[PDB]
Write an enzyme that holds these catalytic residues in place. Structure first.
Site, PDB file in Angstrom:
ATOM      1  N   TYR A  27      -3.977 -12.805  -0.348  1.00  0.00           N
ATOM      2  CA  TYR A  27      -4.835 -12.098   0.572  1.00  0.00           C
ATOM      3  C   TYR A  27      -6.139 -11.724  -0.089  1.00  0.00           C
ATOM      4  O   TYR A  27      -6.349 -11.984  -1.274  1.00  0.00           O
ATOM      5  CB  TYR A  27      -4.144 -10.824   1.033  1.00  0.00           C
ATOM      6  CG  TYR A  27      -3.945  -9.858  -0.098  1.00  0.00           C
ATOM      7  CD1 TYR A  27      -2.861  -9.984  -0.950  1.00  0.00           C
ATOM      8  CD2 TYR A  27      -4.856  -8.836  -0.331  1.00  0.00           C
ATOM      9  CE1 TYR A  27      -2.677  -9.117  -1.989  1.00  0.00           C
ATOM     10  CE2 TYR A  27      -4.681  -7.958  -1.377  1.00  0.00           C
ATOM     11  CZ  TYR A  27      -3.578  -8.110  -2.204  1.00  0.00           C
ATOM     12  OH  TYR A  27      -3.355  -7.263  -3.262  1.00  0.00           O
ATOM     13  N   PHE A  37     -12.285  -5.012  -1.610  1.00  0.00           N
ATOM     14  CA  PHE A  37     -11.579  -4.012  -2.414  1.00  0.00           C
ATOM     15  C   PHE A  37     -10.332  -4.466  -3.183  1.00  0.00           C
ATOM     16  O   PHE A  37      -9.868  -3.744  -4.058  1.00  0.00           O
ATOM     17  CB  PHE A  37     -11.252  -2.776  -1.591  1.00  0.00           C
ATOM     18  CG  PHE A  37     -10.230  -3.000  -0.517  1.00  0.00           C
ATOM     19  CD1 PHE A  37      -8.888  -2.890  -0.793  1.00  0.00           C
ATOM     20  CD2 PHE A  37     -10.620  -3.264   0.781  1.00  0.00           C
ATOM     21  CE1 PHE A  37      -7.939  -3.063   0.198  1.00  0.00           C
ATOM     22  CE2 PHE A  37      -9.689  -3.436   1.776  1.00  0.00           C
ATOM     23  CZ  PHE A  37      -8.342  -3.335   1.476  1.00  0.00           C
ATOM     24  N   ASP A  38      -9.793  -5.640  -2.858  1.00  0.00           N
ATOM     25  CA  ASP A  38      -8.621  -6.177  -3.555  1.00  0.00           C
ATOM     26  C   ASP A  38      -8.353  -7.608  -3.100  1.00  0.00           C
ATOM     27  O   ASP A  38      -8.395  -7.890  -1.903  1.00  0.00           O
ATOM     28  CB  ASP A  38      -7.402  -5.315  -3.242  1.00  0.00           C
ATOM     29  CG  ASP A  38      -6.213  -5.611  -4.140  1.00  0.00           C
ATOM     30  OD1 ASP A  38      -6.402  -6.118  -5.270  1.00  0.00           O
ATOM     31  OD2 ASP A  38      -5.082  -5.302  -3.709  1.00  0.00           O
ATOM     32  N   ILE A  57       1.549  -0.831   2.941  1.00  0.00           N
ATOM     33  CA  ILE A  57       0.962  -0.136   4.083  1.00  0.00           C
ATOM     34  C   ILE A  57       1.542  -0.548   5.436  1.00  0.00           C
ATOM     35  O   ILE A  57       1.832  -1.714   5.670  1.00  0.00           O
ATOM     36  CB  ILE A  57      -0.556  -0.307   4.130  1.00  0.00           C
ATOM     37  CG1 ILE A  57      -0.944  -1.787   3.989  1.00  0.00           C
ATOM     38  CG2 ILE A  57      -1.201   0.600   3.089  1.00  0.00           C
ATOM     39  CD1 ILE A  57      -2.428  -2.022   4.113  1.00  0.00           C
ATOM     40  N   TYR A  83      -4.524   3.589   4.577  1.00  0.00           N
ATOM     41  CA  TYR A  83      -4.401   4.636   3.566  1.00  0.00           C
ATOM     42  C   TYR A  83      -4.791   6.004   4.117  1.00  0.00           C
ATOM     43  O   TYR A  83      -5.210   6.879   3.373  1.00  0.00           O
ATOM     44  CB  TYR A  83      -5.217   4.298   2.311  1.00  0.00           C
ATOM     45  CG  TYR A  83      -4.579   3.225   1.461  1.00  0.00           C
ATOM     46  CD1 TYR A  83      -3.622   3.539   0.502  1.00  0.00           C
ATOM     47  CD2 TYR A  83      -4.919   1.893   1.632  1.00  0.00           C
ATOM     48  CE1 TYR A  83      -3.028   2.548  -0.266  1.00  0.00           C
ATOM     49  CE2 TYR A  83      -4.336   0.902   0.874  1.00  0.00           C
ATOM     50  CZ  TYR A  83      -3.397   1.225  -0.070  1.00  0.00           C
ATOM     51  OH  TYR A  83      -2.838   0.208  -0.812  1.00  0.00           O
ATOM     52  N   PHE A 100      -7.930  -7.565   6.027  1.00  0.00           N
ATOM     53  CA  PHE A 100      -7.271  -8.458   5.083  1.00  0.00           C
ATOM     54  C   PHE A 100      -7.225  -9.895   5.598  1.00  0.00           C
ATOM     55  O   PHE A 100      -6.723 -10.160   6.689  1.00  0.00           O
ATOM     56  CB  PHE A 100      -5.825  -8.026   4.860  1.00  0.00           C
ATOM     57  CG  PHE A 100      -5.644  -6.798   3.982  1.00  0.00           C
ATOM     58  CD1 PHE A 100      -5.419  -6.928   2.609  1.00  0.00           C
ATOM     59  CD2 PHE A 100      -5.613  -5.520   4.538  1.00  0.00           C
ATOM     60  CE1 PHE A 100      -5.213  -5.809   1.797  1.00  0.00           C
ATOM     61  CE2 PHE A 100      -5.407  -4.393   3.736  1.00  0.00           C
ATOM     62  CZ  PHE A 100      -5.207  -4.545   2.358  1.00  0.00           C
TER      63      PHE A 100
END
Lengths: 111, 111
Positions: A27, A37-38, A57, A83, A100
């Site tokens: 992802y 962010f990731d 999540i 979050y 995502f």
């Protein structure tokens, strides 16, 4: 809802992940503003997790099992399934929507 | 070299942070790909810290002091004066150059 999938490329359409299945994904998550962010893709480390068991999540738990094997979709997760108001500080401000890109590379022993 | 400055707006050109000073500033951090990873500015919560004593990354320990009171500049910090090989998981990958927008709001008891 708290999570919405856009389908970007079709999976096999039979093999979906049920609960307690051991998912294997790649992802990349960004913020509404566009900041990455990731990304499991960048790290070439495909993320594995158990699914309906709340180890990720809510938006993920709830949203992934609607992908079939090999599918490429995008998950839009509201802070409420994300979050929350708290967030995951520096990276993810509170009350952050999440976008995502997601690719389902395997269900349990399947690939 | 390790950190490079780019004065965007001039401070009072008299008051510079010397080591062991407590500085007050407002900053935004971004990766080389334009992704913002942290920003006191968006939180509207101005960050305060001591400067020469390694309570921030070295890039700062050495940049902030080149700025005068009121200055707006742009710090460019190699991974080496930043988070280095390990980086800072989720947000900041390993071996990442950093680009901080910085505003020197205060030096000890000055504004």
């Amino acid at each position: 809802m708290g999570v919405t999938k856009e389908l970007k490329s079709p999976g096999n359409g039979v093999d979906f992940p049920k609960k307690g299945d051991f998912v294997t994904i790649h992802y990349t998550g960004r913020l509404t503003d566009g900041s990455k962010f990731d990304s499991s893709v960048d790290r070439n480390e495909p993320f594995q997790t158990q699914i309906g068991t709340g180890r990720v999540i809510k938006g993920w738990d709830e949203g992934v099992p609607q992908m079939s094997l090999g599918e490429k979709a995008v998950l839009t997760i509201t802070p409420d399934y994300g979050y929350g108001a708290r967030g995951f500080p520096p990276c993810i401000p509170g009350n952050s929507t999440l976008i995502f890109e997601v690719e389902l590379l395997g269900i349990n022993n399947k690939r």
